[PDB]
Scaffold this motif. Structure first.
Motif, PDB file in Angstrom:
ATOM      1  N   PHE A  31       0.826  -1.200   0.000  1.00 57.97           N
ATOM      2  CA  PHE A  31       0.000   0.000   0.000  1.00 57.97           C
ATOM      3  C   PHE A  31       0.862   1.253   0.000  1.00 57.97           C
ATOM      4  N   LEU A  33       3.919   1.392  -1.363  1.00 56.87           N
ATOM      5  CA  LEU A  33       4.516   1.478  -2.692  1.00 56.87           C
ATOM      6  C   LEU A  33       3.476   1.869  -3.734  1.00 56.87           C
ATOM      7  N   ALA A  34       2.237   1.404  -3.567  1.00 58.53           N
ATOM      8  CA  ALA A  34       1.162   1.806  -4.464  1.00 58.53           C
ATOM      9  C   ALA A  34       0.735   3.247  -4.238  1.00 58.53           C
ATOM     10  N   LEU A  37       3.599   5.276  -5.788  1.00 57.44           N
ATOM     11  CA  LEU A  37       3.550   5.141  -7.239  1.00 57.44           C
ATOM     12  C   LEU A  37       2.630   6.179  -7.874  1.00 57.44           C
TER      13      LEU A  37
END
Lengths: 46, 116, 193, 144, 147
Positions: A31, A33-34, A37
């Motif tokens: 979560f 890293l998302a 991103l």
RNA sequence: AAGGUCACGGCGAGACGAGCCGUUUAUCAUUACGAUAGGUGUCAAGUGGAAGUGCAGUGAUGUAUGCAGCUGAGGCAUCCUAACAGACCCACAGACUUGAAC
RNA sequence: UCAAACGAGGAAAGGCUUACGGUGGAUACCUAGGCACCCAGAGACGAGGAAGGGCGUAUUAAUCGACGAAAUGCUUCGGG
RNA sequence: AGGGUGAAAAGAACCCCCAUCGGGGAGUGAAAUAGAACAUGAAACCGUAAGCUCUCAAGCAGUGGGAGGGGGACCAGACC
RNA sequence: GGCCAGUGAGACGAUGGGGGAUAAGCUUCAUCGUCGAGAGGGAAACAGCCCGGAUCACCAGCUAAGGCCCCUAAAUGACC
RNA sequence: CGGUAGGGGAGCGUUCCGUGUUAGGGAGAAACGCGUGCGUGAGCCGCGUUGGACGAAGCGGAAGCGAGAAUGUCGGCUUGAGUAACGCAAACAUUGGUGAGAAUCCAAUGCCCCGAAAACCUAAGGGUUCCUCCGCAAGGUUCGUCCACGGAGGGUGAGU
RNA sequence: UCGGAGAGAGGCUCGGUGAAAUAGACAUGUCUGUGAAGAUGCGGACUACCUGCACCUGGACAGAAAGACCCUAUGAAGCU
């Protein structure tokens, strides 16, 4: 080496839920890293 | 124990690791931007900095060591005609280790090498 | 919305006050309030204490002075109060006992040759660890483990004697730091100490 | 039944194991469609992708069967059950043979919009129960 | 198929608090029985008896239903101020009681088995009990022993 | 919130968790901190005279350039590259009861 | 405010109970297929090519049944 | 070794997810929780939700007593 | 007598002995008690030792063997 | 009025049959699940937003008649456990392409291996595995867009 | 002696696939004693918060497999 008896529903739900809680710990990382991103200047993910 | 053993060995034996280094830095110098794993990325970073600064001083001895390391013939002679015109005054740090999504089938931490 | 937890919590406490009833203490108490004779038949069954009968706030507090008192009979008369067997509310499944305080653990008398021949030996799990340790060695070293070892074998060593083990408050000094419930001195029934 | 709130989507006996589908399905419980949309984009599991396919084809279901939005929509229960298990008699040495079971899942994911009233105050009124049926559709701590 | 709506009758909430605060609490008084107490001896065992109580006991030898029965085997009859310590029975004593309908109590499964010596017996027992309601205690005004 | 965890760059730490050290206008000046890892520039250090050319020799080879050439897991310097972008957990005076003085 | 006493109240996998689901095919109701008697009858067929098969035959897949280069059928006499 | 959707395939027109498989609406049906793995579906087994409760504890897991708590209640003392 | 079973491997304790080494929870006999086939209480636990013979219920009382400081019910009882 | 081996007396239940084309039953039978009920108990009776057509009691009879044991047996599903292993230590790496999805399929470039073979052909055996297109339910010890797998079509030409 | 370093394939972690022998249920401590005479399960004491991961195998009289050795069978068989 050969197991003497079998485990309960007790100990098995403990160990399987430690395995799946060990799966829980590696998605707030996903979560993060998302979320990194998304829109922002990050020098990764070409 | 691994106290101070600063060689970065891969999941391959020694001579196969050397061939992985030479081939992957060769095609790294061919295409510029490349998709590796991160262990392969840093392992490219040391050796390709050695190959940029090796033909920085474009003599014959550096060109012959540099041709001895790299596989392809016509890429060493496209290198010393390019690296003093581009990578002069940079003084180290010739790459960039832009990471990406992991690989489908392994969850391998996958990286991406520039030339900057 | 903090008012959900706070205001519905105070509504649950409000209907806790409205539906439920308090539990009266057993002091200058008659048989029943007229509400109680309409409730359960708590007469013909054996009286069992509720949560408002064994509150640790209003328990008794006792102070012995262990100067020139012999160890084991003091440990038995501390045990008979640490259980609750001097109260008519004694149920052996709940903690009806009373806190006790033992000052002057350094000056506990013994009879005969306990001081040089009685051993408080202990052992860990591995062999060859049996610790040679006599009575004068603890009384020189840590005296408040003497009485604490005497009364721990007097209490039922399950889950409930382990709970009333903490009711024991032994101090080696002449003064105890407790001013909890104005501790009245302990009544003895032992003519041979 | 909750008076027409949830959207139940079943699933085929897909060709993977139930337990890894249950760690990836026990991750995404309780979180809305945007968070599961970004987590299941990037979860490093092979059991992630049919789960994300069933979430996507469950909220697209919730937007085309019903008429809701894909932002006010939380995953309600997301239960994963056992399926049919194939049996594979695989030979092994010293003349032995082992049953290797090919397991299948059975995914049933329920989605939940917030179709609320959001009443003004709390204060109880013990009158007109035929309006008290409709004013209270989903609350907590039901007394009497 | 939609979220339903807000409903608009334009209501006004009565915050007078003299109707709901009358409705929610309940006023129920207990009946004052009297200040008396006895201990009767029935069969062998003794019962704490107060006037009005649905006790259970042993008698099913013979006793008709709804009968008015005096339990004159009284010891330790006691008021609020004084009790009467019964040298065995307090004299001229009468606990008026109502022997009600007879009952069978709960099943007590007497199942016995020893060990591998293969023996097991499921039998059951319904004890023929009798519920008695108490009317009032009288005939107890001799030798008071208040403290 | 204080403080942690993930991520990030690693380790004289380590099976995995741990632990530890960083996580940038990454000093400015008069005198101990704000270089983590890689590269680079030098210094220890290892093997030990590299290629090319000239000279001597019929040629194997030797010699001068030249403690040169490579190696640089170690030390110092250098912000050239990566330490970017984040995320998450823990909040809102810490139940009840006695004594002391204020 | 300080000192001392107690450890409530919400706290995790899990345990129990209850409800709803999934694999599973016991129980109940069947049958599309079998078993055994009784009463008769038959135990026949085959060099006029048998029992049993192989291949093939329909307008057009495979399988079974029927059929045999006269082949998913033919002649005659009767029923319909 | 593997039987039984319906009474009748009336076997799901059309829309969405979508490469399929599958799923949800709609339509058929008395029944679609009778959807082709399709008739009643039990136990072991795997689960999810609700109530109470376990992290100083030694236990063939019970039973007798029962603290505290929860649920409906009507013979409100009772029951779980 | 009629019909009709099991059993025919015993064990320990007291007494009377043989074998032994008057050694064995040893072996073989003779009388008896228990277990076998006997629960409960006392014996810390513990078939055979003591009391004792379990139809069942009671949140009844009196006792045998044995006990009356605490764990654990009853005397920190009295006098030599 | 304890009881093992054992002996005797009295009963419950099951499926079928006589009464029986019984009473009752799509106004819900059998089943399955439920009980604040009754029995000495085997069990009965009653209730079910499940199910959908049979079938009681009483008085009688007959059994493939009652399950916790047989290293029983046949199906289903557990434990170990998300553990060992993934079948030589010839070795792959990158860029493009196809796709919804690529470490694995294809193309190119290097790298590496066998090379009295890990090369080519024929005897035996196998029997369609050979080839184009389509598909990824099962198989491939991972994946897969690929396949010795599934489907359709084709293919084996002798006077020597 | 007296080990030490280094290279591979495993082992450890992650992603995929994924068994097996075994298994009455296991809420599965140590000492000491008792007991069918070698007890996590009985007694007394002491010690232990719950639950994983990686190694080691002392016990569970561990797994196998109705002891090949010993004896019994009015067993079987080969051979003399």
């Amino acid at each position: 080496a050969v197991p003497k008896k079998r485990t309960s529903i007790y100990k098995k739900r403990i160990r399987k839920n430690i395995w799946k809680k060990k799966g829980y710990w590696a998605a707030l990382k996903a979560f993060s890293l998302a979320k990194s991103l998304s829109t922002g200047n990050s020098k990764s993910f070409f | 124990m691994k106290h101070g053993r600063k060689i970065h060995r891969l999941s391959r034996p020694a001579d196969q690791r050397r061939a992985l280094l030479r081939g992957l830095t060769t095609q790294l110098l061919k295409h510029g931007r490349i998709k590796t794993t991160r262990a392969k990325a840093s392992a490219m970073r040391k050796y390709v900095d050695k190959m940029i600064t090796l033909a920085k001083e474009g003599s014959l001895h550096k060109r012959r060591q540099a041709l001895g390391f790299i596989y392809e013939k016509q890429i060493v002679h496209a290198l010393f005609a390019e690296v003093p015109e581009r990578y002069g005054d940079r003084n180290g740090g010739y790459t960039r280790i832009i990471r990406t999504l992991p690989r489908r089938g392994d969850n391998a931490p996958m990286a991406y090498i520039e030339l900057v | 919305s903090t008012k959900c937890t706070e205001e519905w919590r105070q509504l649950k406490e409000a209907v806790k006050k409205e539906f439920a009833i308090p539990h009266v203490p057993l002091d200058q108490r008659w048989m029943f309030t007229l509400e109680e004779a309409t409730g359960p038949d708590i007469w013909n069954t054996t009286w069992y204490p509720k949560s408002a009968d064994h509150v640790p706030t209003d328990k008794k507090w006792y102070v012995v002075d262990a100067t020139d008192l012999i160890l084991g009979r003091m440990a038995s008369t501390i045990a008979i109060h640490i259980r609750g067997k001097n109260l008519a509310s004694y149920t052996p499944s709940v903690d009806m006992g009373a806190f006790v305080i033992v000052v002057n653990a350094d000056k506990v008398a013994v009879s005969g040759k306990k001081r040089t021949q009685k051993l408080y030996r202990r052992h860990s799990g591995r062999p060859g660890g049996l610790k040679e340790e006599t009575f004068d060695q603890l009384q020189k070293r840590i005296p408040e483990r003497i009485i604490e070892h005497a009364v721990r074998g007097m209490l039922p060593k399950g889950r409930l004697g382990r709970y009333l083990f903490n009711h024991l408050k032994v101090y080696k000094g002449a003064e105890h730091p407790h001013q909890a419930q104005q501790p009245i001195d302990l009544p003895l029934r032992d003519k041979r100490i | 039944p909750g008076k027409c709130d949830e959207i139940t989507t079943r699933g085929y006996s897909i060709s993977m194991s139930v337990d890894k589908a249950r760690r990836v399905i026990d991750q995404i419980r309780g979180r809305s469609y945007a968070e599961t949309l970004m987590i299941l984009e990037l979860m490093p599991y092979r059991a992630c992708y049919p789960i994300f396919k069933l979430i996507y084809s469950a909220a697209a279901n919730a937007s085309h069967n019903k008429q809701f939005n894909k932002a006010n929509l939380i995953i309600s229960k997301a239960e994963v059950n056992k399926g049919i298990t194939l049996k594979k008699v695989k030979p092994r040495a010293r003349g032995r043979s082992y049953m290797i079971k090919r397991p299948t899942c059975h995914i049933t994911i329920v989605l939940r919009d917030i179709t609320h009233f959001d009443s003004y105050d709390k204060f109880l009124e013990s009158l007109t129960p035929k309006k008290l049926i409709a004013l209270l559709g989903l609350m907590s701590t039901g007394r009497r | 198929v939609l979220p339903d709506d807000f409903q608009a009758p334009e209501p006004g909430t009565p915050e007078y608090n003299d109707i709901i605060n009358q409705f929610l609490p309940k006023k129920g008084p207990p009946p004052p029985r009297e200040e008396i107490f006895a201990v009767v001896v029935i069969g062998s065992r003794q019962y704490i008896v107060i006037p009005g109580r649905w006790i259970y006991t042993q008698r099913l030898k013979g006793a008709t239903v709804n009968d008015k029965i005096v339990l004159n085997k009284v010891l330790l009859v006691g008021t609020k101020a004084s009790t009467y310590i019964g040298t065995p029975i307090v004299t001229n004593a009468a606990v008026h009681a109502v022997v009600e309908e007879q009952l069978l109590d709960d099943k007590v499964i007497v199942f016995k088995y020893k060990k591998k010596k293969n023996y097991r017996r499921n039998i059951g027992h319904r004890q023929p009990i009798t519920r008695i309601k108490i009317t009032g205690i009288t005939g107890y005004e001799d030798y008071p022993a208040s403290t």
